[PDB]
Amino acid sequence: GSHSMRYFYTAMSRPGRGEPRFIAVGYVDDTQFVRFDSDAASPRTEPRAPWIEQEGPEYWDRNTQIFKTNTQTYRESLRNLRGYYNQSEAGSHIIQRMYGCDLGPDGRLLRGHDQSAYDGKDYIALNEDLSSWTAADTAAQITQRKWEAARVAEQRRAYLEGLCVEWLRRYLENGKETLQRADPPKTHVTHHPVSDHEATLRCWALGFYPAEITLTWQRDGEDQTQDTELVETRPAGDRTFQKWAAVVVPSGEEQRYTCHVQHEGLPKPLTLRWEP
């Protein structure tokens, strides 16, 4: 199947409470495999999935040096952005960066990503060409100019097409029993009267990996988008995810409703009905 690696950096200032915290986590698809937290007693890169533990001390130390250096650089960056927005020293602010590479089913680079945000708003992003930037505003333009002058894009491109893909492939192979294993949802439909004349039908998907899933209700074969209550896909804590979709239907019309489930792990997409 298709796979991606992402690192997510969060740098959070907190004036009066020490230097900005920097935390990095790495994911392959929906599987976190590494973390670094500058607030840890002994900050260092720590494994968060079994298949990464086989990496050697050189690997851990390399990650750690990288994250330690980023920790310092992000603190400078927070200072810089505060200035770019004429903000006071009083407020807490956050820079986020998410970057990584997507492979297609053949393991070829599909595309790279390198996006940054400030206080939760798009700030600057590497375009799909991995060569040019999109700055959200005049502040980000300052970063863009600085990065254009330092030919940062070229660096990001080299990483995204090179190390990113190489390491992603390595992880995919090392953790193939899980990373390349799709676990289909376990499904059922529940029925709860909400009154004499309406009942809730809830379509459950449990235990599935990866998180990507489609869960829909149809009435007489028509999508019930607006009438469907669809909870956010949520982690079970055992690597798998859960989701449900609920519709309120006229009592007696239950059999006109079908739940449809699409998931990578399913031999065939599912159609379910309430089974009294």
Binding site: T10, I23, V25, Q32, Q96, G120, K121, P235
Partner: peptide
């Protein structure tokens, strides 16, 4: 879990 975020930065 370790702090992470979604595509919309949340």
């Amino acid at each position: 879990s370790d702090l992470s975020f979604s595509k919309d930065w949340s």
